[PDB]
Amino acid sequence: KTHVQLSLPVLQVRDVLVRGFGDSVEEVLSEARQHLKDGTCGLVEVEKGVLPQLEQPYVFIKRSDAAPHGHVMVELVAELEGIQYGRSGETLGVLVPHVGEIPVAYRKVLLRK
């Protein structure tokens, strides 16, 4: 399927144990997609002071359209040293590995895969 319904655990930035997906734009997009498939991906909501506490390159989920079955359609955009790879809508948050951190909420998304 071109899209997959996922329910992403929303993590507090100070709880996150693994603060990015890797060392290159291509690796972080690769690893993010793998962790989304495997159900091992968390979401951090972006506010003042969040991104400096996480590791670049960043992987964002961005709204791709204006929401089937309560799932916002999203796609992946990476960022490194102020340059983004991809073009999409509003950021819903930054993706990180999930390794058992307790979430505060869930974000239902329809991921363009």
What's the CATH number where 98 sits?
A: 2.30.30
Which of helix, strand or coil describes residue 88?
A: coil
Vertex 36: Cα angle to 18 and 24 (nearest 5): 55
Residue found under tokens 């989920």: 61
Count of the separate structural domains present in the chain: 1
This PDB structure is determined at a resolution in Å of 1.6
The domain of 68 spans: 3-112
Contact 95, 60 (CB under 8 A): yes
Residue found under tokens 């690893």: 31
- In the numeric block, which tokens belong to residue 80? 């490194």
Q: Give the integer Cα–Cα distance in Å for 78 and 76.
A: 7
